[PDB]
Amino acid sequence: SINYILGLDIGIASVGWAMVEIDEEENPIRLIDLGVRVFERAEVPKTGDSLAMARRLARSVRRLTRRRAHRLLRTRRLLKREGVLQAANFDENGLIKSLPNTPWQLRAAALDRKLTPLEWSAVLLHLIKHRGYLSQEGETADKELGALLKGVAGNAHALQTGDFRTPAELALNKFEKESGHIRNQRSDYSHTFSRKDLQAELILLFEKQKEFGNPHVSGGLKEGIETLLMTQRPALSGDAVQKMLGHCTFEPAEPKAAKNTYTAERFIWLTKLNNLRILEQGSERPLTDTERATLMDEPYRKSKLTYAQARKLLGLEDTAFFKGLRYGKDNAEASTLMEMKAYHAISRALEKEGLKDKKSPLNLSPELQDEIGTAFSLFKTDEDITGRLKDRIQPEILEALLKHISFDKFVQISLKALRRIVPLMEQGKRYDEACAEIYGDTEEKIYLPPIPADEIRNPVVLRALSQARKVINGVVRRYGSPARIHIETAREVGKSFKDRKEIEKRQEENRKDREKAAAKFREYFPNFVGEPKSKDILKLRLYEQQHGKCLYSGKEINLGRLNEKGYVEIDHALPFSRTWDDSFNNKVLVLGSENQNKGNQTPYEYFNGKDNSREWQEFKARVETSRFPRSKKQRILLQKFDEDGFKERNLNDTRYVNRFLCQFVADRMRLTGKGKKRVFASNGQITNLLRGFWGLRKVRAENDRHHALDAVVVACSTVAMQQKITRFVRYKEMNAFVLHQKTHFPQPWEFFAQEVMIRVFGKPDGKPEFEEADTLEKLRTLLAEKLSSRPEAVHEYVTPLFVSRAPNRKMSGQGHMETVKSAKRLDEGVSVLRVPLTQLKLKDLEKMVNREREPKLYEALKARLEAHKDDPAKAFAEPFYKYDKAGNRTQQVKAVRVEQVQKTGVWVRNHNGIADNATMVRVDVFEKGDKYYLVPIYSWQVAKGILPDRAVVQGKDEEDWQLIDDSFNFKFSLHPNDLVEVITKKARMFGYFASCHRGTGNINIRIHDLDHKIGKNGILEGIGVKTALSFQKYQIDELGKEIRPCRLKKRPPVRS
Template sequence: MSERILGLDIGISSLGWAVIDYDKNNSLNNKIIKSGVRIFTIAENPKTGESLALPRRNARASRRTIKRKKRRIKGIKNLLVKYLDFSKDEIFSPKNIFNEKKQKDVWQLRDKSLKRELTNKEFARVLMQIAKRRGYKSNRKGEEKENSEGKKVLSSIEKNKKLLNNYLTIGQAIYQTTKETKTRRNKKDDYNHSISRDMLVDEINIIFEKQKEFKNPFVSDNLKQEYLELFLKQRDFASVDKMVGFCTLEGKPNKRAAKASYSAELFVTLTKLINTKIIDSNHKERSLTKEELEKIILLCHQSEQPTYLKIKEIICLDESSHFKNVSFYEIDKKTGEVSKKTTKFISGFKGFHGLRKVVEKTFSKTYWQNIAQDKKLLNDIATIFSHHKSDEKINNELQKLEIKILNEDEKQILIKALIENIHFDKFLNLSIKAIDKLLKYMLLAKRYDEAVELCKYIKDEGTKQKFLRALNKDEQSELTNPVVKRALSQTRKVVNALIRVYGQFDKINIELTREIKKSHSDRKKIEKAQDEYQTLKQGIVKNFIENFEKEPRGNELLKYRLWQEQGERCIYSGKEIDIKRLISEVNYAQIDHILPFSRSLEDGMINKVICLSKENQDKKNRTPYEYFTDEKKDWHWFEEFVKSLKNIKKGKRDRLLKKNFDENSEIAFRDRNVNDTAFMSRFIKDFIENNLELKSKDKQKVFTRSGTLTNMLRHNWGIGNKSRDNHLHHAVDALIVAFSTQSEVQRLSTLSAKIDGFTYEKSEKKAGQLKFVPPLEHFRDEVQKSIDDIFVSFAPRRGVKGAAHKETIYSKKAEKKKGTFEINNGLAENGEVKRVDIFKKDGKYHFIFLYPSDFLKKELPLLTIKGIEIDDSFEFIFSLFKDEYIEIKQKNKEPHYGYLKFVESDGRFNVLPHFQSQLNKKDNRISTGSVEYIKKYQVDVLGNTFEIKREKRVGTKKQR
């Protein structure tokens, strides 16, 4: 019986989908129903990875800062009128006392204020300058010490404080030390003249005292008091209490635990340790015992990152036992040699040791040993520092804590030390209440899932509905990655649209491209590594051609790469491999899977070596360790030989020297190479499975497939390499993912086992018969037929938000150019075109380009790009936004079809064909000067197109 399966290939800005019918018992019933591609913009700045909202947020913050500064300066000016005998005109008019020419250097006046009486003008200038640049004030001292820029600022402030040993005020010190150069302002990356606000407050007090001594008639206590109030007024940093989500197990009102709290750190450390496995002397796998966990936790209290050798010693692990997938000694990445360093266990006790260092430095180890016993106190301290973002609020909350071993004076000393040195942020998904319940069982060596069950937490699996719902508020806060949020939002739209057309599915197979599971910086590293690999590959190809005088075919290049990597020797015998015979004789040297493919389903370069055919024949379906021990070969020699190969990377070396590959290890490897268990994949899988009705009666209905599996199937099923020149390869991947059912994976494994079992003399003939059979006849042709029928759907960008103008404001004296407008007593250039309004009259088309600033006006402009004023005699046709599909024809030319990507200032459209992935500005530019006709189409999420004949022109919000 056939099942209807949906395959999804989800990327950071793309979604490939495929609907198939699949019958595990009869491949003749297998059928491709439909496939497609949805393209959308990535939810981050492609260059920096920052939020798309960050520029607006920064600009808004700058506007607020400027607004507050103006308000403060206005208040100071009012004080000058009130107390220094000035008229409002003298202070507020454009020709005020501060703009007069040939005045004394105000820095000199700050020096003179300590030596003689100042006039009211001089005093006003001094007070105004100090108020304008009121020095550096840190809301969080501990945070600044972890910030490289903050460290530089604090370092410069400390350096400038030393000047006060020789001078009375910081103003006097700066003037006297810069009289010759007059360089008193910081420049980019130069913090030499940084001063603190406290230093300026001291200067203000001293100036008032000196001027009082000099009988200055304008000095008064009221002026000083009101001036300091305005000078020091600053909005405090808000706490993040309201932004912290609720516990995923306990729910409201239990807030999530601070990551640096003791309970959270113990939970994280135990999770790591419980998932760590030991391979004993009989090559059997076991977990750590309760007693071993206790000893390791005590060790982690003493050292945040103890070595695995130390852990092995403290739990009395015998010499022949080791931790699974852990090398006790680190391997140098460049040389491949064992370094002097030993591998460390990274515990979760970073916050614990941060507090320990502060307490021990402030008091002693004895004090810390007593404080460390109070787990609630440690939790409370971490919570306070994680929730509050200003020293003042942190201090207020710390004052409320009871620290039994300290008297009041000691408590104040400790609070001061903590504020100056501690900075905590980030939260787990669980509350301290839930964590403490789980810890009772995890300390008994129970896994997290077992502890959850023992605590009788019932997982809310949601209410399954016919259509996939949107993320709720809690899920939005749990899923913090905006890139994944947008991808999931687009996935939901596509899935629901497909259900409306094809009905409910039986199962869904999902692949997330590895980019979507990585941070922006990690994706950049991947791109860099890919570029480096391509450069390396080109060099190897060039070298290959020089040696063999021909282009490499099939697996010839792979053989050559492995031959170079292994020092031109057979990996299992160490014998030299003759380069002349390497390529010319098919059965002289062969590629071997280190861990047999049928047992690991790992087909990457990391699991491949080259060896003489006789060695491959003898090794059969075994690991190197099994081969050497079964055949009584010298394993010690092999270990030393592998370690001597400098070009072998750690991952491959670990596979070559792997001793334990029992049934559990096989299952783990195969599961990893078939199913994607990364957090993002599990989140999306669980969300779909818990909220969408699926028809299958099987227990599991949603599967996450790894890129390794789909890439393997792509080649085994004869599809070949991806073509990234267009978007259609996303649909090809989705088709492969859709057909990557459990039955096909089992078939792949079974067939591989048969091939692995043949000796090489016998296998040549049989292997020709044992082909990897695709899931349906003429699979490659059927795939091609399906993607030929695809119309790629782009998500249109109809938003008109964005910078109203470019950042630079020019003087009004500058020449007013096309595309500029007046703002803030200056001229600014327009931002990017957000919308194109198209009118028609007497058979001619007219275009109005609209910028973000236009949508802030009462009415939209009516002037075309050619300067023609639009009136009632013009007919409005429609508006165009980015990524809307159009057909445009110029006179005497063939029509162009494609998505509008952007508009150039000279009026040309840049149009991208629906399947094309890269924009070539020269090939895709279309002039709007001689348009015969232009049509606009709506493209739905599945790629269906509908012509839009007419629209009503939408005005601004003010206009409506």
């Protein structure tokens, strides 16, 4: 039973944790346990797609093909029921025998001639199979669907205007004569037809065949066939889409709804307006009631209320700048600040159709606007919306609205709750005050409950928080409930894939910008001790940025005497002791002589700033005429800030993830905290500062282990430690004497740096060449030798760090590769694939099936390919034909058959095709005669239920493998990311199984911490286990403990 703080460091693919045993006085004294837990981040890695997307797309494809086949089956059953095929025109399975293959021609000729049961059946089945596109009205808004719609609408207009009478006749004549094909190809939506046109054609065909005397034009048949051609299931209902999103959380009975809503838009507007404060050079202030009243109605009156436009309305007078606005960017005040999208969308729809006098206020009630928003956000068809708003608004207005309007995107509050909030908020009263006044807002247990997927709407964040939960629960099980939990989450957690990519881009931009700056520093100071740190480049940059003038005095400063120690200091304008702010906005370059009488005062409070002393006016003029950004100049001259509030905002991180985590862990965990918040979300900047100043230099390490290092720092950041640091900084700004030399910046305890380094990396810092203390003996002896002074540096919990990789024992997944190949010539190791000429490369054509039998074609294609430098899409961009012996042109070519290698595969499409293996889900390991045999198990084998017979052999093509029988002893099954041990002749290999090559029977294992010095990027490749001495599989928990060999009894099956 120990009193300890648990420090967590959360990122998109790692959680590092540390345990610190503290005094009752909350001072950190003992480092107990640390670990790292790494997983794969919850997105498709290269593109940022979600893992669910790949599965959902396949699901919708499954449903589409299934429903089409079912509809066609019902059509055939209806044909039999209505006499049309009379009996046993069908085959052993429900398909019609001797069905004609000319349905386009028969459809076109059905208008002029009585058809036949076979031809009539073919026509109706063809109409059912190809029933064209359905509108689902105002559809012009989406990249392609626009293109398909362009083709559809073009062909519909051409059908009705140019006299061709039906889709069949127009399609036949135009497509055959002008293109040589009817059905679309490769992506083209040129010949697509709308369902309306095909329904008209079906009606006309029934009329004509009644005219010509077709025994089967029964009312039953017409009813059935029309219903089959027109019916499809309803899209998601209002209540169903509402069931998808949570209850309001304010009024459980009512749902959260409708961004495009007068009430919702007004909530957004009032939140912005109430939170909008203007900073004028000097200090901050919020809008007076008259200013808010002035701006309140302008978003409705104008199209958008631009920031500069708002400056016009208030006569704001430059030297008055908006806060929450990047003013360095040029013409920044063209930003929107507010746009009522819904109000103006409704207004533009009415304006554009003749029901609204433009720039006359929309007279519709707030209730009606809310209703329109909810209706248009909940239904995706004209009919449904038509009913909903047919209840409450006049017909012409609704028809106009159904045109031009597309709505989406809900906002997590019930219109009843927002209705109560926005009258309360209009009065004034920031959001939380009104919310508490209307409905003011705790069941503790030992173990953190699962992360609520509702509050965390993000897959990456959900997986990161879930693995943090697993880490927490394991730590608590092993050591009991923690006193406090400190949290430090990466900047990248909770950011769009676009956002993270752009952040990486600018990080590299800053890398090269700083390298250029460093080169400039080297040129200016050629003789310099080693390489320039960050503060040195900042010194030079501030020197040039300040006009070569010390900002506190205006006395010129000698360049080249910059690194003459103590000549120039980087002063914090606002004192660190009172603000805990060391931004790049709070750093000025001053002389050592002048920066000794400032004390712990702000620049405003030191140049008096209250009587406008001419020293203060000189200083303010100096800072305003420097090449400082606006933000920096604002901060330097703050005058009237909230000391404690400002240092608090600079001390912790208030992001969405961190606030949610602090409230969640505080609510539902044991956590024997003293009582004030018991959960702390450390600001990243201050944590990096503490790392640097506590001797934790940012190492040059591949290890995921560094994640634990940070976790230690955040765990030592306690209120007592913070106040001790503040006191030290205070006594340091007033020139301490309480001696001078031995006044190390307060550390959690002595030799903290060295012990933490040994504990995390198993090496004394600065010796990456040294060998690691792999074992308890090695580590404890190293700690007792290089930290003989420290009594508690060794104890019963000090074990080497072993990073824990979340396992993946999933038995499911892609059964085979996506393209299906011809399997006829599979006795020979080959398969055939139709390769277009646009994709045709020389190494494809060299294996054409008809390379021997089409020598003219072979030579023509080969020569053509030689030209244009083997560029497939370029070479065959102009139509390619075949030629007879007499030189005549005969017939085009679109694609040729190409041979491919195929030694293994999966049977697909009614055993009429072969596809490549996808990904192995398991490897069964057998021992026979001190040699190891790997049987690979793929997912299609799991589906079919066939526990494989044969184990790999290096070079034999798949057929000739070692058949496994009861003479072999089976040891274990390997899933991806299981811990394995390969004791071999060369060395001893330990690590997480990653891949098992099937052409070699070797396996790759990731080193647990992915140290780049080992293998290539931490992966041992091509380890041969056939002739290993030992080959065993181990188990490991979240924390990296309990590492034991596991012995399986029986080989497990593939299905249950």
